[PDB]
Structure 1
Amino acid sequence: SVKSEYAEAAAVGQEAVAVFNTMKAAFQNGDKEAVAQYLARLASLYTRHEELLNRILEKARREGNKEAVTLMNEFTATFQTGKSIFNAMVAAFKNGDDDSFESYLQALEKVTAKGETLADQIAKAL
């Protein structure tokens, strides 16, 4: 079902949460080699989550589930906000700009925290 697909997509999102919080500890400790690897892992995780979400939104559209489509439009938009901040973070790491990396990291945390009530609302809607 689209609901199990959303639970499967949510689990991937939570994997990225885990690798992010590990990445944050490594950044604070100055273990740049670990950070590089975690950033690659996150890129792969976010790329998968985005594709899953897009499939869920298409299926909800084909099913005519207007409320779920509304929420998935809202949530996917926020996803891109978090994604763009992530990409700027990766660029800050490449550039050696730890001040920017810290800024983007905190912003990505807040964008993620805000979007959680909506994430829960989608599970119930599908």
Structure 2
Amino acid sequence: SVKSEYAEAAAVGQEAVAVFNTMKAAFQNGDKEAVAQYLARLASLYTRHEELLNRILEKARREGNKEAVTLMNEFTATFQTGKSIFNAMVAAFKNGDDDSFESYLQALEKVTAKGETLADQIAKAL
């Protein structure tokens, strides 16, 4: 069901949380080789999460589930804010700009924590 597809998407989201927190520790410790690998892992995870979310939104639309479509439109919009910040973080790492990396890292954390009430709302709506 679309509901079980959303639980699979939620797990991929939690995997990115886990890797992101490990990556933050590596960044603080100056282990740039680890950071590079974690950033590649996160890009793959976000790409997967984004695709699963789009399929869920498209299905909710085909089902006529108006409330779920509303919430998923809002949620995917916030997802893109996170993605833009993530991409900027990756660029800051490439450029050696640790000040911007720190800034983007904190912003991505706050964007992500803010989106969690909506994430739970969607599970109930599907």
* TM-score under structure 1 length normalisation: 1.00
User: What percent identity do the matched residue pairs reach?
Assistant: 100
Give, in whole Å, the separation in 2 of the partners of 1:64 and 1:94: 44
- How far is 1:119 from its partner? 0.1
Gaps of 5+ in 2: none
User: What is the distance in 1 between the residues matched to 2:58 and 2:118?
Assistant: 18
Runs of 4 or more, structure 1, over 6 Å off, are none
Q: Take 2:38 and 2:28, find their aligned partners in 1: how far apart are those partners?
A: 13
Deviations 1:39-97 (A, max 9, x none): 00000000000000000000000000000000000000000000000000000000000
Unpaired stretches in structure 1, ≥5 consecutive residues: none
Q: Distance in 2 between matches of 1:45 and 1:79?
A: 13
Q: How far is 1:123 from its partner?
A: 0.1
Deviation, structure 1 residue 23? 0.1
State the aligned residue count: 126
Alignment RMSD, CA only? 0.1
Q: How does 1:31-70 map to 2 (within 5 A)?
A: 31-70=31-70
